[PDB]
Write a protein that binds this ligand. Structure first.
Ligand SMILES: [Ag+]
Length: 72
C-alpha cells in the first residue's frame, strides 16, 4: 500500500516476478506493467505515477532468480 515507497511493494512476490524478468529483459517493463494492471488496475495507475522508482528497483539484482526463468 506504499504509493511512493515502492520498496514496500518490492517485498511482494508479485513484484519479484517483475524484478527477476527485468534483469533479463528490461524492455519488458511496459509488458510486465500489463500484468500488474490485469490483477491490480488500481496499483497499476499508482505505479504509472511512480514508474521511475519502479524501473530503477526492477533493474537491481534480486535474491530469488525465479524458477520460471523468464529470460529465454
Ligand atoms: Ag522518491
Amino acid at each position: 500500500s506504499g504509493g511512493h515507497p515502492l520498496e514496500f511493494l518490492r517485498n511482494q512476490p508479485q513484484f519479484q516476478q517483475m524484478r527477476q524478468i527485468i534483469q533479463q529483459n528490461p524492455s519488458l517493463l511496459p509488458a510486465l506493467l500489463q500484468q500488474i494492471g490485469r490483477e491490480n488496475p488500481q496499483l497499476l495507475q499508482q505505479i504509472s505515477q511512480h514508474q521511475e522508482h519502479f524501473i530503477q528497483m526492477l533493474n537491481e539484482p534480486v535474491q530469488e532468480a525465479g524458477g520460471q526463468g523468464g529470460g529465454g
